[PDB]
């Protein structure tokens, strides 16, 4: 063969914090297919929005939106627990099929995106150049979002454990833990990554006894 | 400047499932410094081994070991709650300093790795060629490890939710969930991504009552 069909730009979805998560890497030979299991961002979330992106930037807002669709009827469960398999499938004709399937409810939804969607060759070159020129600022964005997501998990799971420990947690500890949770929740609302890390570390440092109690419960 | 000091190969650590996780990318200019927070792989683990790797392969075993050290004193917590900060620092002389610090306990341990450690030039070129030739198999291993680690988390969070629900969970459900938990555990020990997925899905299907109970 003298030529191959290949993807000029990465293809993926928007994930928690406004990030583009890639499912098909730039320069993949098509036909190609790829699935990845994702989940909900909140407790008891009953739907997910699949927002399909083309491009090389880390902020989903700086990529090219191809379309979106919702999958409904996800049964009540803690955040991160439902199993939503998302599949990108690009055929020999450059048509992209994107689907989401809830492995538990059996529900599925899908869309079809035309070969002619997304950026033209000029916009493709500009997007590559732009990603290169903002590589630092994109990397800092992605890392603030990861830190925020790790801090959010630490916060809600530490709340969950306070609740389970009940009066087994001594008064002074509950106080120090409440103080640290408040400072942490305030930091997660800012855009200062070192501050979030400082506050997560502070929560870690006053949680020793809470964690011992979780050990006793589940052990 | 007419020359730069650059890493010819990625440098990183072994992580859960036996995979290499990069902390300094291939072709970084030195001096350089990079930190990333990692954690325990099991509930109440009191120590981690930091195993320092050089190379472009996904399986830790296919890379060059540059050495390892332990960090202990880690206080009891659920899996992935302790904050273990791993720093790779290569100074202007090409000496790699690896340390780990437990942000809780404040304990810290390090090792220094000579500039001449690791693969020679011929070996670097074979490493880059082997990584290219096994790109697909390496991706599949990595995906297998990711799925497994996901099932492992599903397994333990489900176990703790059964413990917490206690006698609120009906007898039929305690037994079904436990049977699906054991099946998922057996699958995680294998190397079939799809069979792990089917077992994570079967566990979900019998865990419905558990999820409502958990919600309160």
């Amino acid at each position: 063969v003298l030529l191959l069909d290949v993807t000029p730009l990465s293809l993926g979805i928007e994930t928690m914090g406004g990030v583009m998560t890639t499912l098909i890497a730039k320069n993949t030979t098509i036909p190609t297919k790829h699935s990845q299991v994702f989940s909900t961002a909140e407790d008891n979330q009953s739907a997910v929005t699949i927002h399909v992106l083309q491009g090389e930037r880390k902020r989903a807002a700086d990529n090219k939106s191809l379309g979106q669709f919702n999958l409904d009827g996800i049964n009540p469960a803690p955040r991160g627990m439902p199993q939503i398999e998302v599949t990108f499938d690009i055929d020999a004709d450059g048509i992209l099929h994107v689907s989401a399937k809830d492995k538990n409810s059996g529900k599925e939804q899908k869309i079809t995106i035309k070969a002619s969607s997304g950026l033209n060759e000029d916009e493709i070159q500009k997007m590559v150049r732009d990603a290169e020129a903002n590589a630092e600022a994109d990397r800092k964005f992605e890392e603030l979002v990861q830190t925020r997501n790790q801090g959010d998990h630490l916060l809600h799971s530490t709340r969950k454990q306070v609740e389970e420990a009940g009066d087994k947690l001594p008064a002074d500890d509950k106080t120090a833990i409440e103080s640290a949770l408040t400072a942490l929740e305030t930091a997660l609302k800012g855009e200062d990554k070192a501050a979030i890390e400082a506050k997560m570390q502070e929560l870690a440092q006053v949680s020793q006894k809470l964690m011992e109690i979780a050990q006793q419960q589940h052990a | 400047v007419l020359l730069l000091d650059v890493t010819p190969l990625s440098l990183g650590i072994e992580t859960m499932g036996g995979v290499m996780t990069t902390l300094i990318a291939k072709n970084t200019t030195i001096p350089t410094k990079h930190s990333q927070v990692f954690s325990t792989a099991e509930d109440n683990q009191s120590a981690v081994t930091i195993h320092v790797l050089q190379g472009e392969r996904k399986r830790a075993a296919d890379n060059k070991s540059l050495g390892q050290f332990n960090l202990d004193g880690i206080n009891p917590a659920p899996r992935g709650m302790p904050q273990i900060e791993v720093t790779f620092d290569i100074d202007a002389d090409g000496i790699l300093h690896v340390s780990a610090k437990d942000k809780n306990s404040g304990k810290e341990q390090k090792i220094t790795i000579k500039a001449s450690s690791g693969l020679n030039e011929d070996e670097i070129q074979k490493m880059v060629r082997d990584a290219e030739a096994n790109a697909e198999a390496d991706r599949k291993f990595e995906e297998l490890v990711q799925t497994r680690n996901q099932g492992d988390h599903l397994l333990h969070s489900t176990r703790k939710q059964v413990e917490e629900a206690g006698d609120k969970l009906p007898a039929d459900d305690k037994t079904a969930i436990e049977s699906a938990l054991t099946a998922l555990e057996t699958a995680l020990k294998g190397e079939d991504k799809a069979a792990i997925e089917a077992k994570m899905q079967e566990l979900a299907q019998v865990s419905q009552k558990l999820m409502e109970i958990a919600q309160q």
């Binding site: 979805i13 928007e14 994930t15 928690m16 914090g17 406004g18 299991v37 994702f38 989940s39 909900t40 961002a41 909140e42 979330q45 009953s46 739907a47 997910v48 929005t49 699949i50 927002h51 902020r59 807002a61 919702n70 955040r79 991160g80 627990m81 439902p82 199993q83 939503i84 998302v86 997501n149 | 996901q150 988390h153 599903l154 969070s157």
Partner: peptide, 12 residues
């Protein structure tokens, strides 16, 4: 950076 209603997160 404005959240959508039903964001997609990481399967844990």
């Amino acid at each position: 950076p404005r959240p959508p209603q039903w964001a997609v997160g990481h399967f844990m």
